[PDB]
Structures are given as structure tokens and as C-alpha cells.
Design a protein around this ligand. Structure first.
Ligand SMILES: O=C(O)c1cc2ccccc2[nH]1
Ligand SMILES: O=C(O)c1cc2ccccc2[nH]1
Lengths: 231, 232
């Protein structure tokens, strides 16, 4: 149906057409008022245009990369070289305590060292509630509990230390993070299980295509630079 | 600085200009490749422009509305007619049970009814883990626990019944909501405090200005309808 000039294509259908009509009426009025000729409007339209030109070009390059056949050896070599970083699933449960100075940390660790086995985690819980400067933990008073997490979910040096422990054990030397020094207690830790090559393969193809696509974009962009007047 | 013809408008800045340059290069190339001449691109631009026309029109109406001073008696009559519904602060802690059909709810309530008070809430908790159709509640298995909430956060019919209970008491007849039928147990409930007009003033003005802005859009749109050739 038609609102003045503009074209639009059960009983609910009518209500929809009513909304469409109202919208066309506002569009027409906005054009009549020349709101698309305000600088703000023009600026916004060109930002959108630039963004969309860049994204369509990207899609074009991606569609050309998706055509390239990735060799089996390249996916198997990627699997062998990156499985232990990318395809091992291992959930840990741990508590931590964060402090300002490596000395404070050392003293806390000393306070745990002297506990009987039965009282180790309780002591840790108490020291976390008393001394942590992790604001989340300090506020929750949950004994420095981090819940369950993967190695690729915490900062690398924290994750390494946590996963290197065996359950029931804590770090005997403080751990350096930018937030300060951590003492970590491991409650539990699953045995690592790696995804098999056949299970990782589609993911691997996608990661190698992503790699080709980014290299291709950077190659193309450098060719465009060498043929452009930049000042 | 300038990329071919295109124009661009200390170490973060360097990276910024570089990234901007790369983007201009891509924009120019996309133009060279005539990606802006495809049906898809023109369609997208047309949609974005239409949307933005409507938004700028609205924004304009809002800018004209914000100039209007809302009369004091309007805000005071708003306050007086709507204070007990909108401006009472009352925090509650309660447990609830949602069911599809009223009969299930009644059986559940009777199941609580046959319990001594000391085992009533444990019974409520079991019943909540078993028969609730709140998926959040069903998944947490926390006994229909809702934490703390204000009186203006729940469905009206929920809040009236939950807030009419005394602490430790539960609803003796199920409560009708669109999600089904409810049974409520009241753990805690603060004493109601109604906000003063002086405290309600800034929030109220924002509500009444909103009321006008929506009324003003409808008024104008209806006039726009009478001066247009609509054909169906
Ligand atoms: O900001 C903090 O307190 C904090 C950092 C951090 C890093 C890894 C694990 C736990 C953590 N907590
Ligand atoms: O959708 C639901 O299950 C649900 C409705 C509702 C109303 C008040 C309090 C809690 C509630 N939960």
C-alpha cells in the first residue's frame, strides 16, 4: 500500500500495515524537514558507509579464502604443534589469596605450612578472608574461592601455577601477577583430556582459514598503500 | 592527513593514524570494486537512512518537549494518585512456586498445610524443587528463593500477595500471574516507607516529560495522516 508516495510490501496483518504507514509518514516528514541534510546526519551516514564498505570488502576476501584447499598435513601439524595449548580440556577448582608484598605472601604460606592436614584448607580460607586484597573475594568472604575454571580463563602465570599443583596442595612460592602476589590452594583438578584430531579438525580448518584471511588482508592493504598518495 | 584524495580527522596517535589510513585504503578499494553499487549495499544504506530519519524526527520532538514546564499540581496529583503504587520502598525476601494449573498449586499448598510450622519451609523447599516451572528456580534447586527484591520489581499481583504475608507465613490460596499460578512463602519484609514529593520530584518529572513526548508523537503522526495520500 502507499503513503503519499512511499510504497509498502490474518487480521494482525492490518495492525502491521498500520505501523508501517505510521513509519512511512514519519520518514516522509523527516525528509520534508530536511533532517538528512543536517551535518550530524551526513556524518553518521558516512561513518556507516565507511564501516560497511570495509565490511563488504572483508566478506569478499573471506569468500575467496574459503575456496582454498587446506592440506591434511597442515591441519595435522597444526594439531600436533598446538593440541596441548588449544585442545586439552581440564577444569580446576581453586582458592587464592592476593597480597601487596612477596613477604606478606611468604608469611601466609608459613602459616599454612604449620597446619595439620585436616586444618590446611580451613586455615587458607581464614587467611583469604582476613588478608586478601582481591575485592571480590574480600567482599564475598568465601575463602578466596575462584570456583571452576580452565587454563585459558585466568592470566597465564596464575593458571600455570594452579594447574601444576596436585589437589590438596598450595603454592609454596608466591606467584607474580600484576595485581600483586598470589598464594594458591588447589581443591580439585580433573585429569587433562585432549580432543582427538578428528574432533578438532573442523576447528583447525577454521583457524587456518582465519590465518589465511588475515594474511591476505594485510597483503592486499600493503599493495593498496604502495599505489596510494599518503600524506 | 590525506590518503590519495580521502581526508583523515604521541605514540597511541601514531597507531591511530595508521589504522585510519588502512581503513581509508580499504574504503577506496571497495569503491573501486563497486561494492557500493550492489543491491545489498544500497538496500542496507536505505534501511539505515530510513531508521535514522525516524530517530532524528523523534529526537527533535523530545527536544521540543523538554522545554515544556510541567505544572506543579500535575506532579502533585500524579504523586497523590500514584504514590502507593509507585513510591513505596519495601524490600522483601521470599520463596515462590510457579505452576501451570491452579489445581497443582492447591495440592501443593495443602501439602504445606499438613506440616507443622518448623517443617513447613523445608516442605516448601522440596515442593519448589519438585513442581516449580520457574526455569531459573528449577535449575538452581535453591528452593524457589528469590533473594531480596523491591515492591516495584515484580508483577503487581505477585507483589500484593507476597507483601501482604507476614514473615514465616505462606499464601493459603494460589496467586494468578501470566506465567501460571503462584504460591509464596515470606522470609523477611522491611517496613514500607513512601517517598516524599520532594524526593519523587526528579523521577516524576522524567515520567511526565516522557508522557508528553509519547503523546506529542501520536498527535503529530495523526495530523501527518490527514495530509497524506494513503491508499490500501
Ligand atoms: O584483581 C584480582 O584481585 C584478581 C586477579 C586475578 C587473576 C587470576 C585469578 C584471580 C585473580 N584475582
Ligand atoms: O517467570 C517466572 O517464573 C516468575 C514470575 C515471577 C513473579 C514474581 C517473582 C518471581 C517470578 N518468577
Amino acid at each position: 500500500t502507499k503513503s503519499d508516495f512511499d510504497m509498502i510490501k490474518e487480521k494482525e496483518k492490518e495492525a502491521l500495515i498500520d505501523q508501517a504507514i505510521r513509519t512511512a509518514l514519519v520518514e516522509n516528514e523527516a525528509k520534508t524537514e530536511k533532517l538528512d541534510s543536517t551535518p550530524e546526519f551526513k556524518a553518521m551516514m558516512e561513518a556507516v558507509k565507511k564501516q560497511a564498505l570495509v565490511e563488504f570488502w572483508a566478506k569478499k576476501q573471506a569468500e575467496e579464502v574459503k575456496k582454498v584447499q587446506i592440506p591434511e598435513k597442515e591441519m595435522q601439524d597444526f594439531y600436533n604443534a598446538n593440541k596441548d595449548q588449544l585442545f586439552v580440556k581440564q577444569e580446576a577448582h581453586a582458592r587464592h589469596i592476593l597480597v601487596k608484598t612477596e613477604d606478606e605472601a611468604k608469611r601466609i604460606i608459613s602459616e599454612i605450612d604449620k597446619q595439620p592436614k585436616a586444618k590446611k584448607e580451613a586455615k587458607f580460607i581464614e587467611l583469604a578472608n582476613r588478608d586478601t586484597i582481591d575485592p571480590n573475594s574480600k567482599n564475598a568472604q568465601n575463602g578466596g574461592d575462584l570456583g571452576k575454571f580452565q587454563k585459558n580463563q585466568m592470566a597465564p602465570d596464575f593458571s600455570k601455577a594452579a594447574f601444576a599443583l596436585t589437589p590438596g596442595d598450595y603454592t609454596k612460592t608466591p606467584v607474580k601477577t600484576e595485581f600483586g602476589y598470589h598464594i594458591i590452594y588447589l581443591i580439585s583438578k580433573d585429569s587433562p583430556v585432549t580432543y582427538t584430531y578428528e574432533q578438532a579438525k573442523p576447528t583447525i580448518k577454521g583457524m587456518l582459514q582465519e590465518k589465511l584471511f588475515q594474511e591476505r588482508m594485510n597483503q592486499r592493504i600493503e599493495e593498496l598503500r604502495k599505489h596510494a598518495k599518503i600524506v
